[PDB]
Amino acid sequence: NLRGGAFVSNTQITMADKQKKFINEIQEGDLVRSYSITDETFQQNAVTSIVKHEADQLCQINFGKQHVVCTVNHRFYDPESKLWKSVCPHPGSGISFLKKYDYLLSEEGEKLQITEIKTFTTKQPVFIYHIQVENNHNFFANGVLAHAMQVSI
Amino acid sequence: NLRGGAFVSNTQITMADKQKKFINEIQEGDLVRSYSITDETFQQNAVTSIVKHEADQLCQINFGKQHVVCTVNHRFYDPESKLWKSVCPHPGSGISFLKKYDYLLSEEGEKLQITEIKTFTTKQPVFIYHIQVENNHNFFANGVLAHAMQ
Ligand SMILES: [Zn+2]
Ligand SMILES: [Zn+2]
């Protein structure tokens, strides 16, 4: 399902060695760059699941010229306010609103400001992907910290 | 739960006789004004359920000076594009985005343009309510057509 949201196929995932791979090429057992919010350290972790879905509703989040495209309900870490945030959080989920001028955390641990957010509907449904990542349950999508799908959700 | 969304306690519901009652005063068996999209006719229908929740995340949808305050995932009928819409539709739900300059359907069948939408977080959780309405599964909240929890 799409309860944790999903990224478009050409979203780049930061591998453990800081190489970049498209999410649609990710496989179970792939080692990705991940982050433990308490230690404030970067750790490698295996992908334990990768699933392909479809949807026609997406949001583009700009941070400078760089951007990420995902379902409106994907969660991103704001390292300024130290909160997990989404453009469209479910009420009672405990996830905060993600808005223009909020911050994302880069794969090098820097605060990147969000300069623009837009929602749009594609003519046809496009392929989207969600992954599970052991231990830290997060990864870097186009260089910013995003939350991985969880079973406990 | 809050999958269908909910309205704040001081949301006015149009009764069958076109009187207004606060959603927090609504009772099972109350007859409310409702709408069948196919017939394009107004019908009376009984509330079958009313539940009180809490949340601190809300959006305000303005249509002129009037507005409605609900969870971001509440569905409203746009009579211009003839689609059910939400500020924050769940992906794959088949609900379209509701945005500034879209349209709402008044309790008298008139298209009212949305002039502003904003999301905010309250200091403390507030009480919010969803209802079930037989047959048409909709009602008028501050005079605009809204979907009832299916
Ligand atoms: Zn899934
Ligand atoms: Zn409920």
Side-chain angles (χ1 to χ4, degrees):
Chain A
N1 70 153
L2 290 165
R3 83 184 176 270
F7 286 108
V8 300
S9 55
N10 74 340
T11 304
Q12 288 188 300
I13 304 307
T14 310
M15 310 312 283
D17 61 354
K18 295 184 195 194
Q19 274 191 278
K20 308 286 187 274
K21 210 207 283 197
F22 294 124
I23 191 162
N24 69 334
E25 290 175 349
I26 284 287
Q27 293 187 316
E28 226 165 295
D30 282 349
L31 264 34
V32 296
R33 190 164 175 86
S34 124
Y35 187 56
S36 73
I37 77 96
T38 58
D39 290 26
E40 302 204 340
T41 71
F42 296 84
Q43 298 168 349
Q44 37 172 255
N45 276 308
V47 173
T48 57
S49 178
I50 162 102
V51 183
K52 178 172 83 146
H53 288 290
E54 304 195 338
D56 64 338
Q57 288 180 143
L58 295 171
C59 78
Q60 181 174 314
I61 299 158
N62 277 70
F63 41 99
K65 290 185 159 324
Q66 235 94 352
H67 60 75
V68 79
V69 178
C70 54
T71 56
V72 291
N73 69 328
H74 214 114
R75 298 126 158 243
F76 294 97
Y77 189 67
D78 180 329
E80 169 69 11
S81 55
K82 285 188 164 62
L83 292 163
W84 288 96
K85 288 183 176 183
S86 174
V87 173
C88 277
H90 197 266
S93 73
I95 306 293
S96 301
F97 286 112
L98 185 75
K99 288 189 165 157
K100 191 166 170 177
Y101 312 130
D102 280 353
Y103 289 105
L104 301 169
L105 185 69
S106 80
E107 61 183 37
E108 292 301 341
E110 301 254 302
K111 309 192 177 177
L112 310 178
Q113 193 171 236
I114 299 175
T115 54
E116 192 60 75
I117 295 168
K118 299 132 185 196
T119 63
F120 62 97
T121 310
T122 58
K123 275 307 199 92
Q124 305 271 305
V126 298
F127 297 133
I128 59 195
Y129 295 84
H130 66 64
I131 56 175
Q132 294 183 179
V133 173
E134 80 190 346
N135 303 321
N136 283 157
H137 305 108
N138 59 41
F139 57 96
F140 289 93
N142 293 356
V144 294
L145 184 62
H147 202 102
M149 236 207 86
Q150 291 227 238
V151 74
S152 304
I153 295 191
Chain B
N1 64 168
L2 292 160
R3 26 222 240 209
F7 287 106
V8 297
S9 51
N10 67 324
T11 304
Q12 289 191 285
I13 308 303
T14 309
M15 307 310 287
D17 63 0
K18 297 189 195 195
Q19 274 187 278
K20 307 283 182 277
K21 209 208 283 213
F22 295 118
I23 198 168
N24 74 338
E25 289 173 352
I26 287 286
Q27 287 191 322
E28 224 171 300
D30 284 2
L31 262 39
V32 300
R33 188 158 174 88
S34 100
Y35 186 57
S36 88
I37 73 94
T38 57
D39 288 29
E40 301 198 347
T41 74
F42 295 88
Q43 297 162 349
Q44 60 179 222
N45 275 305
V47 176
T48 53
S49 169
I50 165 100
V51 179
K52 178 177 85 143
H53 289 288
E54 305 194 345
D56 61 343
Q57 285 172 147
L58 294 171
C59 74
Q60 182 175 322
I61 303 165
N62 280 70
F63 41 100
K65 285 175 167 326
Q66 322 287 96
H67 60 71
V68 77
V69 182
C70 56
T71 56
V72 292
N73 69 333
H74 215 112
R75 300 125 163 241
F76 300 87
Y77 188 67
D78 183 332
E80 170 66 20
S81 42
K82 286 186 163 63
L83 289 167
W84 285 101
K85 296 190 172 182
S86 168
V87 170
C88 276
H90 194 263
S93 74
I95 306 297
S96 291
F97 285 112
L98 187 74
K99 284 178 165 162
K100 192 161 168 176
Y101 309 129
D102 287 350
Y103 282 85
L104 296 177
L105 186 71
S106 88
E107 65 181 39
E108 293 298 339
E110 300 260 306
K111 308 183 178 181
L112 311 181
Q113 182 171 249
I114 299 175
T115 52
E116 192 60 64
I117 296 169
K118 87 251 246 209
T119 62
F120 62 94
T121 310
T122 53
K123 271 310 196 94
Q124 299 279 310
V126 298
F127 294 129
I128 55 175
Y129 292 82
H130 62 64
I131 58 170
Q132 294 183 184
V133 179
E134 87 198 333
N135 302 320
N136 287 151
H137 307 106
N138 60 36
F139 59 94
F140 292 89
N142 294 355
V144 290
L145 180 59
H147 201 97
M149 231 208 94
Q150 281 284 203

